[PDB]
Amino acid sequence: KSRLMGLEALKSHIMAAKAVANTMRTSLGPNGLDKMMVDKDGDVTVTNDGATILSMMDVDHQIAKLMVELSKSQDDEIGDGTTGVVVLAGALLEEAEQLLDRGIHPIRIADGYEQAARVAIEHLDKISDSVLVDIKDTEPLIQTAKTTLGSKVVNSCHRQMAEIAVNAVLTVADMERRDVDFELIKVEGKVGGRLEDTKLIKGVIVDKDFSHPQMPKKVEDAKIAILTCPFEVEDYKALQKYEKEKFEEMIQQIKETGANLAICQWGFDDEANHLLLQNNLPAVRWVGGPEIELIAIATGGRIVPRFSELTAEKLGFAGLVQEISFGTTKDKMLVIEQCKNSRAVTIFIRGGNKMIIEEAKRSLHDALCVIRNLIRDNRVVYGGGAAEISCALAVSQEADKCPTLEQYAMRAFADALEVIPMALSENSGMNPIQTMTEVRARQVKEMNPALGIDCLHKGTNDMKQQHVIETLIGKKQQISLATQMVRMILKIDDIRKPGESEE
Amino acid sequence: GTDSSQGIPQLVSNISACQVIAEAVRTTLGPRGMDKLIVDGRGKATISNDGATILKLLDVVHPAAKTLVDIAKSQDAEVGDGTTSVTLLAAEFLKQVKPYVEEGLHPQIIIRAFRTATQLAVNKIKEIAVTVKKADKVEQRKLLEKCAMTALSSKLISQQKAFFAKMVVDAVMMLDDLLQLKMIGIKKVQGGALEDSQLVAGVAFKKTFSYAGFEMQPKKYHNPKIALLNVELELDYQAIVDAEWNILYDKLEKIHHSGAKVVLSKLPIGDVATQYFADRDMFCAGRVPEEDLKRTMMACGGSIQTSVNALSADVLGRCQVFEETQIGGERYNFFTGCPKAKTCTFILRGGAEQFMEETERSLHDAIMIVRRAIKNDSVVAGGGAIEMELSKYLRDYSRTIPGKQQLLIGAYAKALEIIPRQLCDNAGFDATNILNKLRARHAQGGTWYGVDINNEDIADNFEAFVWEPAMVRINALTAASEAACLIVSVDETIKNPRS
Amino acid sequence: ARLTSFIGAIAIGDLVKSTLGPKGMDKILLSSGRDASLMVTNDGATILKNIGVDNPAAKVLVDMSRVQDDEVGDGTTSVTVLAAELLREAESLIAKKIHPQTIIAGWREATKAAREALLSSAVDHGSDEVKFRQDLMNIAGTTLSSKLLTHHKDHFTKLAVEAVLRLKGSGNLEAIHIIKKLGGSLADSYLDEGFLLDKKIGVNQPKRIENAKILIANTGKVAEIEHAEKEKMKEKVERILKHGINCFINRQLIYNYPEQLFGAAGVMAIEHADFAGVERLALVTGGEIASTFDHPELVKLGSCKLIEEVMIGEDKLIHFSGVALGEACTIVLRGATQQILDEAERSLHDALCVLAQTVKDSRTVYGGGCSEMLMAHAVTQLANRTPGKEAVAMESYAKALRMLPTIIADNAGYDSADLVAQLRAAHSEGNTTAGLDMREGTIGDMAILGITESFQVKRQVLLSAAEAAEVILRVDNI
Amino acid sequence: PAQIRFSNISAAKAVADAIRTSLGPKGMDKMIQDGKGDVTITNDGATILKQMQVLHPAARMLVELSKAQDIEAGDGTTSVVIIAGSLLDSCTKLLQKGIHPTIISESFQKALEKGIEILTDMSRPVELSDRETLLNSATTSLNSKVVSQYSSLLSPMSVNAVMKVIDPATATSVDLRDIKIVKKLGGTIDDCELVEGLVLTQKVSNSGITRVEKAKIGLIQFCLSAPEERAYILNLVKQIKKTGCNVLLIQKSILRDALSDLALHFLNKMKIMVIKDIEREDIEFICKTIGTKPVAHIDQFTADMLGSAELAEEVNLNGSGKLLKITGCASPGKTVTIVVRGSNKLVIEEAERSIHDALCVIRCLVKKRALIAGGGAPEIELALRLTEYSRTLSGMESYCVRAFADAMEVIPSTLAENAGLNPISTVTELRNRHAQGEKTAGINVRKGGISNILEELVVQPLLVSVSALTLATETVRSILKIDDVVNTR
């Protein structure tokens, strides 16, 4: 019958896996053709980030399942440019098949790609003309956030948006440990709004209802609760005695304890809250669960849903006195901003488009990696393919003073990196061969390594004046976690598929 | 369409069945063997380079394949690694004895020839066995560190593998009670350089939401021990709330009364209720792995509990010290300091994530190599030098014996030669030159010229301290011969179905 | 059946499309499997000649290219490509439900504007104004496109510039003459005064003759009347000694008893040359053609003054010099292959034909396709003016005029979607002197770089292409 | 356009890789039973290509390449096919990458001239005064044969044939044209001689004298015709009696009776040479030898048709071979003399064939007066230098010249493959040894090992490699430019 095995297995997986890369190699670059996302249920959206593309796609071959598994293990590392790992995966796999045509064993191709990567990262450190003083760099951080927004008209509000980004990385700037944690989630995206109404609020505005629907909302006092207290005619008369009891024992236990804006998560009757309103104190019914940390950090406290543990130093906490109409046509939401600073900080987005919500959360997280890589390791590389051409030239140069057959891996390596400026030039609607080799000749005649591919269609190929800037951690992680998986695919030969009844 | 159930078709079907299951584990031989990927069928991707880890998770439908995979199962119960070598050797025995069967030679004759050749080989391995014990291996232990160096020699890891070699000889020497893979775990730590790794004297576990409660626990404590509980800790309509409040009260009071420092369970503890179960007044832990369950009871000694106010004698009994430290930034569990310390866990502090695979391929046999070089001293070389010496001896024994066994013992000889031939093919070199240049100076110069895995040229593995245990090779080729003669002795497979 | 006419004509225009321009790539004229072995050719004119054309509507386009062939030489490929592009444009207008007669009328009034807009940029060169040389060497070189003979290209322009003093009566293309042998290269051509046939009496026949009055011979109880016919042909050889001639054309075959008896009477009998050279023998030397020669007795012969026959360097290198009208400036190369035989003759005919058009009328327009863009912009401006459906029929007439400098850029290997469109945009304001340079592949001043083309081939292309279009468009059935 | 260009690529690569294994002296012989009874046991691929049933035109161009290489240099006949097939194969990546074929063509021309100038100065010049390097090239060429014992018998003879007439043809280089050749059955091999003038091997037996100092030559091709034509035979021999010729050759072009006894007795009464059916290709060079005019017309005989001679004898050379040796003509002796005498048949064909190979190698040593170390070394050298040149090069050419480089490496690897070595590793170590050592490092197929071949003495004249590279690049260029076929003339 049939049984696919041997080196023909390695031929079949590569043309499988690079086919996935052939899906993603048109999404590289900010001028890359961004791409829909249609569920089996029937939902429809658009996305440009390749990580969402590979994650929410459902593949059939196990090599592609491995690919999306490992590239989701790159999203925590970088999250930006995870497309290029798949593109380099397809490129190195194609060149490895080209070496397999001449009979080289794929183990030798794999560790030759490893030696070429050990040329690559170190030469990337050699061409690292980074500016390391990028700490109080509020003026070049406009250009840092500029290329992240460059595919849209968000640059026209980057005087708002990029300054939101620089204030965001200012507020999260733990100057010694240098990380966004699980508490510092920087998103409040109001679906509906405009370009500038994505603006500066370091506070909590969630869609929960009021204490009273005509209550004076001015609760300046930090004396604010959060309750773990649920609802858990002699039946209703005993329950009403429990209700006025719950008043004169829960609220009087509060008067012993200090948990005043009783935002209950469960059932309640608001006439007790109305009698609190006649005594001039608020209490909200049926509020949401996991927002206790986000509310409570607004002066510096943490999660306090308890009856008794919410004391005068661990109250429900509030940010900054401002009173704007949250729901204009919507119900006006909670003013949880009165008092002090929020470390686990969260910004006001009023983006009406799901694209501008998706980019302003995840490109802000990518800032939170690369402006983390302006504090954690302040090493930037001028991108736009210039890093790849500068790296590939030295990989080909180190493929000269080495005596082994492994040499043919490194020449197969460098050309594979040439798919990165090619797909930048192909998606930007130019000649992919001639532009990249002209930039390569301009680099071999002029030793500036910041000559790349004009993706923005600006003046020249010099990435200094246009500031197409990646970080060296984002480049090194990309190349190393492309090599560490090209070796993984090349080390795997026989997919004896279970349940696929081998006759 | 091919029907094969008569006697010569029976044996031909049996040896094709062993050849296919040998090809199913052919590439995995050696330290740098090719990985094989299988699934469960539902999406549980398993990439393996081990043999029995492949073979158990593999399917097996054939009778003769099933009656060799039992020998394969028997070989992993000794040390683990080596199950591919015995199966590949027995399959090459069958493939080399193949053309003699259909030409008209009897299976009992070739079985007896296999047995006599095996007795000759197990004789000749004993005389060339060399002990290396009192050449400074436990006192002035550095030469036993030198074979600890044989895991990752002359690499960029080798500078850190100096520390890894010192710590693997410590991970063997401090705990030698016929040590196992269970008593020494490795723990991956992201971030940092590979030189910053460690070997702790105790357990080490990352804490998650369902794992463990709250920091600032009694670390520097004289006798910190464990409650090992199997009940949860977490939180008519007027008669169901007060009972839960009272249960919250008595489970709070259990921590004061029993005096447990850290309660352990296979049940979730709330880290969204972090201070709320710091309002248990002490540390706790939940959702426990079995290695934590052993290595804090068989080594530390934390007692097991049953009820509402379950007190015991070993919830604050004799262990040395507690620790909870940002190892690589993330705070980990440490019930370290075990009074019955067959527990020293490796702490892989390093940057890249897939170096866990590198260490669990390269230091998971280095523990085996070092603890075997302590366990066995009568050792021989590796790299297929030993099979080559036995092949030379039996190539002589074939032509120096009259009778029909002469063609069979030589068939016993050349069938050894795929052991390095599969090795270099897993390395990448040409098998033909690396075998001919091996055999020339092997038949002229000396014995222990072997196949080097790094530069792919014939070297002296006895001088590179590549020690293979003599008893392990004895059991290996004994099992290879036994699984050979079992399939050769099999002719008929009677089915007798249901219907 | 109107669609398959368009298909048959578009296929013929495609089979000269990749040979358009002097970067054209060669096709294979494989044929009937007896001895078809190979034929590579950049010349698209001989491609359609060796095409066995099946559709009869495509035969009309083939013969329109044949009308273009004998007119000026090269220009068949441009006319065929432009006409097939006009038909590919017109079938898109037919599917939008426009009547073909309106498209024909639009072709006509568009071709009128495209004809006069060539005259708006009618630049005349200084070879017929101030007696320059290189300006006409440019058109003599670009008519030698897709060829090799660039070494003695200056000899070709010498035969051009000696024509305006010696070989024009009205731009005479009968005083030109080309022959060659094999063995050697481009560097073998020189000035000769006729054909290559030798003295034939042998080692005794001397070189210089006195006066060659020259015409055609006839030839050279049953056996006795056979001897009487021998006596009559012997009467003829007595009647030719009293002439006094020194050469003669021998159009019919002759053995040694007529031959030696001719040459002993001083008659050099030239055995049956090709009649095209005998045309130059007829008046340029001055010796006519007949069948009988009984009645020319002293007066009705040919008239010339000197004919000499030398033997230089492995050829029959006869230099027929000293003729009465010394105009038969003959090229004798010694080429490489058999292909250069027809190639040098037909290419000098193509070159010196439009060079004779310049010595008639030396106006020229810049080549490289910028004249096509000028006619395209001129008919596009008239398309924006007139109402009716015919304003659509002008626009597609623009589009084929965009495709003619496109294909020249396309067979150059370069991109053609950008800088042809850049040339179209730049031609609207950066006026007519700009254009496409194919050799360096850019946009440059064609008047500075001198890539010109004769007006008497551009008008003949642009008129006859629409003339071929209006014929086959008006045909619908069979 | 692309779908037919790819078909040309595939057909030419198929016709090139069908003979790619036969490269080198260790190239294995073939056996294909295609045609109508063809047995093709031969290790040389030229006669393999001459019997190939070729239908595709681009595949036929590579067969034309073999005969072009045979005419130009005679050596490297399979190499001009294998290099062309590798270049057309490497053009597929350039086609699928996006480069138009005209750019590929001109970049291949640039790499061709760069490779030619890199090859021609990395060589060693040999001189016409040096006759020892002619014996060196003979030991590379005339030996390793069955004329290995006839190499001392044959090589200095042709060397002295050039030393006699160092002829002014193609910059005073060796033509096919020293002093006329013959070949004769019977006798022994050492009965070869360097003649001086025209020799006939055909049989004349005149009891009358044919041995005259001032012997005349008449080139009468007119044989006898039957009737009247008897009186015409009489009249012809009256003209021959008026001639006085004694060494006239006589052809059978008109009819088959050439000198019957009416004419034959009247021509042994004046005792003429009678040799019939002169071999037709050597007739015109006999005309270029003597000076008598190629005239079958019996009445166009003149006194200047008196062909001149000094000594013409029907002499039994080497004891018993009655041959007609003539000296003292106007230009006596056209081609290149090796009188291949020998009793066996293999010493008749193989001595002549090896002398033709010696002719093609001595004309190769003076058309271009240099010589390189053969055996895969200059291909590796060009693959290194053109890779550096393409690294310095700009534009879309920078890959194609690089694609010109890698396709140059098929000649050593096949030489590594045919010699039993592992090809890719041996090519890698050959490149690494050459990059830090010398040019002359190659693959000694005569001993089977990678070494310095200038020590191991397998060298070749430079014009073989330059002509093979130029012819292969030109055919690759043309087949790249071929983009359309059309049938039915």
DSSP C306-335: -------TTS--------SSTT-EEEEEEE
Tell me the residue type at A264: C
D315 and D225 co-located in one domain = yes
Q: What is the DSSP string of B47-91?
A: EE--SHHHHHHS----HHHHHHHHHHHHHHTTTSTTHHHHHHHHH
Q: Annotation-wise, does D460 bind a ligand?
A: yes
Q: Give the nearest partner residue to D100 out of C27, C36, C413, using CB atoms.
A: C413
Residue A460 exposure: Cα atoms within 13 Å on the Cβ side: 7
d(CA C143, CA C354): 9
Pairing mode, strands B262-264 and B283-284: parallel
Strands (E), B282-381: 283-284, 326-327, 330-333, 345-349, 378-381
Query: Residue D475 and residue B64: Cα distance in Å, rounded?
Result: 61
Q: Which of C69, C350, C410, C437 is catalytic?
A: C350
Three-class secondary structure of residue C40 per DSSP: strand
HSE-CB at B434 with a 13 A cutoff on CA atoms is: 29
Instruction: Answer yes or no: do D360 and D376 share one domain.
Output: no
Chains B and C touch (3+ CB pairs under 8 A): no
Sequence letter at residue B377: D
CB atoms within 10 A of CB C448: 10
Domains by residue range for chain C, with CATH: 1-124+362-478 (1.10.560.10), 125-192+326-361 (3.30.260.10), 193-325 (3.50.7.10)
B41 CB neighbours in chain A (<8 A) are 498-499
- Which tokens hold the place of D165? 């007439």
**Left, alpha or beta for D308 (phi > 0: left; psi -120 to 50: alpha)?**
beta
D328 and D199 co-located in one domain: yes
Of the candidates A148, A118, A122, the one whose C-alpha atom is nearest the C-alpha of residue A369 is: A148
Instruction: Give CA–CA dist A27/A84, Å, rounded.
Output: 9
Q: Do D199 and D330 fall within a single domain? A: yes
Q: How far apart are CA A184 and CA B353, in angstroms?
A: 25
Task: Judge whether C92 is annotated as a binding position.
Answer: no
Closest by CA to C10, choosing from C356, C476, C469, C463, is C469
Cβ distance of D98 and A432 shorter than 8 Å = yes
The structural domains of chain A, ordered by start, are 1-131+379-503 (1.10.560.10), 132-202+343-378 (no CATH), 203-342 (no CATH)
Q: Which residues contact A39 (CB under 8 A, 6 or more apart)?
A: A56
The residues, ordered by sequence, that sit 6+ positions from D352 with a Cβ below 8 Å of its Cβ are: D183, D338, D340
Indicate the CATH number of B205-346 among 3.50.7.10, 2.60.40.1180, 3.20.20.150, 1.10.3720.10. Answer: 3.50.7.10
* Neighbouring chains to B with at least 3 Cβ pairs closer than 8 Å: A, D
List residues of chain C with CB under 8 Å from any CB of chain D: 15, 18, 23, 25-32, 36-38, 40, 47, 50-52, 202-204, 256-257, 260, 411-414
d(CA A344, CA A183): 5
Select the residue from B21, B37, B59 to test the A interface by mutation, using most A Cβ atoms within 10 A.
Answer: B37
Nearest chain D residue to A431 by CA: give it: D98
Residue D41, number of CB atoms within 10 A of its CB: 7
Contact predicate C348/C329, CB 8 Å? no
Backbone angles phi, psi at C443, to 5 degrees: -110, 125
Q: A103: which chain D residues are within 8 Å (Cβ-Cβ)?
A: 423-424
Q: CA D77 to CA C462: how far, in whole Å?
A: 51
C-chain residue closest to D301, CA distance = C202
Residue with tokens 């501008």: A356
Neighbours of D313 (CB within 10 A): 17
User: Can you give the length of chain B in residues?
Assistant: 499
* Other beta carbons within 10 Å of D388: 13
Which of residues D309, D334, D359 is at a domain's end?
Answer: D334
Structure tokens at D396: 């879309």
From CA C352, how far away is CA C329, in angstroms rounded? 13
Tell me, yes or no, if D3 comes closer than 8 A to chain C by beta carbon.
no
C361 and C447 Cβ atoms separated by less than 8 Å: no
CB neighbours of A154 closer than 8 A, spacing ≥ 6?
A161, A195, A356, A359
Q: For B128-210, where are the alpha helices, taking DSSP H only?
A: 142-148, 158-173
Query: Taking the C-alpha atoms of D282, D286, D289 and D293 in order, what is their torsion angle to the nearest 10 degrees?
Result: -140
Chains in touch with D (≥3 Cβ pairs < 8 A)? A, B, C
Q: Are B225 and B319 in contact (CB under 8 A)?
A: yes
Cα-based torsion angle of the residue sequence C33, C37, C43, C47 in order, rounded to the nearest 10 degrees: 0
- Residues of B with a known catalytic role: 50, 83-84, 365
User: For B462-488, b where at least 16 C-beta lie within 10 A, e where not — what string?
Assistant: bebbbbbbbebbbbbbebbbbbbbbbb
Q: Annotation-wise, does C189 bind a ligand? A: no
Place of tokens 């294998």: D82
Q: Which residues contact A214 (CB under 8 A, 6 or more apart)?
A: none
| D104 lies in the same domain as D146 | no
Residue with tokens 């005596």: A403
The two structure tokens encoding residue D466: 């330059």
Q: Considering only alpha carbons, which residue of chain A is nearest residue D428?
A: A405
Which residue is listed with tokens 């033909």? Answer: B432
Query: Which three-class secondary structure string do you get for C78-101?
Result: HHHHHHHHHHHHHHHHHCCCCCHH
All residues at 6 or more sequence positions from B445 whose CB lies less than 8 Å from its CB, including other chains: none
Distances (CA, A) of C106 to C310, C460, C465, C477: 62, 19, 14, 22
* Nearest CB to A66; choose among B23, B45, B237: B45
Q: Which of C471, C466, C478 is nearest to C86 (CA)?
A: C466
CATH of the domain at D329: 3.50.7.10
Contact A62 B37 (CB under 8 A): yes
For strands B35-38 and A492-495, give the pairing.
Answer: parallel
Measured between CB atoms, does B174 come within 8 Å of chain A?
Answer: no
Binding residue per annotation — A151? yes
**Inter-residue contact D105 to D477 (CB < 8 Å):** yes
Contact check, Cβ <8 Å, D429/A437 = no
- Residues D361 and D469 occupy one common structural domain: no
Q: Please tell me the distance from the alpha carbon of residue A370 to that of residue A144, in angstroms, as a whole number.
A: 9
Q: CB–CB of A487/A114 below 8 Å?
A: yes
Does residue D305 sit in the same domain as residue D376?
Answer: no
Q: Is A320 on the interface with B (CB under 8 A)?
A: no
**Upper half-sphere CA count for residue D302 (Cβ side, 13 Å):** 12
Closest CA to D50 of D77, D73, D28: D77
Cβ count within 10 A of residue A280: 9
DSSP H or E run through A188? strand A188-189
Resolution in A: 4.0
Residues 6+ apart with CB under 8 A from A398: A116, A119, A410
- Please indicate if any CB of chain C lies within 8 Å of the CB of D34: no
User: In which element (H, E) is residue A239 found?
Assistant: helix A234-246
Contact across the interface for D394 and A103, Cβ inside 8 Å: no
**Which token pair is C430?**
């950066």
What residues in D contact B433, CB-CB < 8 Å? 422
CB-nearest partner of B39 from A5, A290, A497: A497
**Chain Cα centroid distance, residue C196:** 23
Cβ atoms of A312 and A352 within 8 Å: the answer is no
The annotation status of C75 as a binding-site residue, yes or no, is yes
What is the β-pairing status of strands A35-38 and C27-28? Answer: unpaired
> Taking CB atoms and an 8 Å cutoff, what residues of chain A touch D425?
405
d(CA D342, CA D339): 10
Judge whether A82 counts as a catalytic residue.
yes
Q: In this complex, is the C-beta atom of B1 within 8 Å of any C-beta atom belonging to chain A?
A: no
* Cβ–Cβ pairs < 8 A, chains A and B: 66
Residue of C19, C41, C76, C157 marked active site: C76
Question: In angstroms, rounded to a whole number, what is the distance separating the alpha carbons of residues D483 and D28?
Answer: 35
Side-chain half-sphere of D234: how many Cα atoms within 13 Å?
5
CB atoms within 10 A of CB A178: 15
CB atoms within 10 A of CB A174: 13
Long-range contacts of A21-24 (CB under 8 A, 24+ apart): A21/A86, A21/A87, A21/A89, A21/A90, A21/A91, A21/A93, A22/A90, A23/A53, A24/A50, A24/A53, A24/A54, A24/A83, A24/A86, A24/A87
Q: What is the CATH number of the domain that holds D455?
A: 1.10.560.10
By C-alpha distance, which of C309, C275, C279 is closest to C196?
Answer: C309
Which three-class secondary structure state does DSSP give residue D449? strand
Residue at B282: amino acid letter: M
Domain count, chain D: 3
Per the CB < 8 A criterion, the answer to whether C215 and C298 are in contact is no
What is the CA B329 to chain-centroid distance, rounded?
A: 30
Length of chain C: 478
Residue B308: how many CB atoms within 10 A of its CB?
Answer: 11
Give the count of beta carbons closer than 10 Å to the beta carbon of residue B64: 23
Integer Cα distance of A193 and A369 in angstroms: 28
User: Which range of residues forms the domain containing residue D133?
Assistant: 127-193+335-369
Beta partners for residue A189, in sequence order: A349
Cα distance between residue B409 and residue B11, in whole Å:
20
**Which are the contacts of A194, defined by CB distance < 8 A and separation ≥ 6?**
A350, A352
Q: In angstroms, what CA-CA distances link C449 with A445, B105, C125, C437?
A: 30, 92, 14, 9
Measure the CA–CA gap between C328 and C159, rounded to whole angstroms. 10
